[PDB]
Amino acid sequence: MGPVWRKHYITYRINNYTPDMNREDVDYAIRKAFQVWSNVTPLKFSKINTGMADILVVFARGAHGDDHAFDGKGGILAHAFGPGSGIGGDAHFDEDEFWTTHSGGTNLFLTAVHEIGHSLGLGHSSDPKAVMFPTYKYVDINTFRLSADDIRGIQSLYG
Numbered sequence: 001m002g003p004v005w006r007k008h009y010i011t012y013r014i015n016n017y018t019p020d021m022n023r024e025d026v027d028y029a030i031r032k033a034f035q036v037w038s039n040v041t042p043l044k045f046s047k048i049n050t051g052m053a054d055i056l057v058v059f060a061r062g063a064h065g066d067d068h069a070f071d072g073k074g075g076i077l078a079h080a081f082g083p084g085s086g087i088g089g090d091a092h093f094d095e096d097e098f099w100t101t102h103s104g105g106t107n108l109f110l111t112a113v114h115e116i117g118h119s120l121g122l123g124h125s126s127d128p129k130a131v132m133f134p135t136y137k138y139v140d141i142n143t144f145r146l147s148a149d150d151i152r153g154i155q156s157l158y159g
């Protein structure tokens, strides 16, 4: 259930960049992660560099100014706030992970899909093939698809 955005145009901004990947690969992973969700809802996402974005994307370490301190390498990979003003919507990625484009380390795209689900108001799935299942798993990103449960969940919130 959860809170939802009360509009269908949502902006995001990348506050800072992990040194683990180059800038263009970070931008690509995030853009594609938003596209997964826009593909099955009325939502549209635009990246901005200037202005007040709804969803701020942040890489940070350990205790980083909120109530969800990170824990070093492993364990919690990221956390995101549900829809709302201010820190609402924002997605934080633990810099103590090694973010990648691929299967090594922690794949940024797949983690971002999961986190953006939370930023849009989804909770966890019991479907062990759903991207909103609680625990990270690498799957071939070239053939990645939302599960029927993920699509059901997001279409129940928007549209």
Ligand SMILES: NC(=O)[C@H](CCC(=O)O)NC(=O)[C@H](CCC(=O)O)NC(=O)[C@H](Cc1cc(-c2ccc(-c3cccc(Cl)c3)cc2)no1)CP(=O)(O)c1ccc(Br)cc1
Residues within 6 Å of the ligand: 068, 073, 074, 075, 076, 077, 078, 079, 080, 106, 110, 111, 112, 114, 115, 118, 127, 128, 129, 130, 131, 132, 133, 134, 135, 136, 137, 138, 139
């Ligand atoms: N246990 C694991 O598998 C990895 C280990 C990471 C490592 O050791 O490198 N860690 C994890 O999975 C940890 C577990 C955290 C925990 O419960 O203690 N999860 C987290 O770190 C959550 C963040 C997270 C989950 C994922 C994810 C999940 C599923 C899939 C996927 C893709 C395709 C198919 C399938 Cl079946 C699954 C891909 C990525 N990506 O990010 C934390 P969060 O859910 O945002 C959260 C919830 C509540 C609060 Br309150 C704060 C944050």
Ligand SMILES: [Ca+2]
Residues within 6 Å of the ligand: 070, 071, 072, 073, 074, 075, 076, 077, 094, 096, 097
């Ligand atoms: Ca961690």
Ligand SMILES: [Ca+2]
Residues within 6 Å of the ligand: 053, 054, 055, 056, 084, 085, 086, 087, 088, 089, 090
């Ligand atoms: Ca916000």
Ligand SMILES: [Ca+2]
Residues within 6 Å of the ligand: 018, 019, 020, 094, 095, 096, 097, 098, 099
């Ligand atoms: Ca890192």
Ligand SMILES: [Zn+2]
Residues within 6 Å of the ligand: 064, 066, 068, 079, 092
């Ligand atoms: Zn945080």
Ligand SMILES: [Zn+2]
Residues within 6 Å of the ligand: 114, 118, 124, 133, 134
């Ligand atoms: Zn989660």
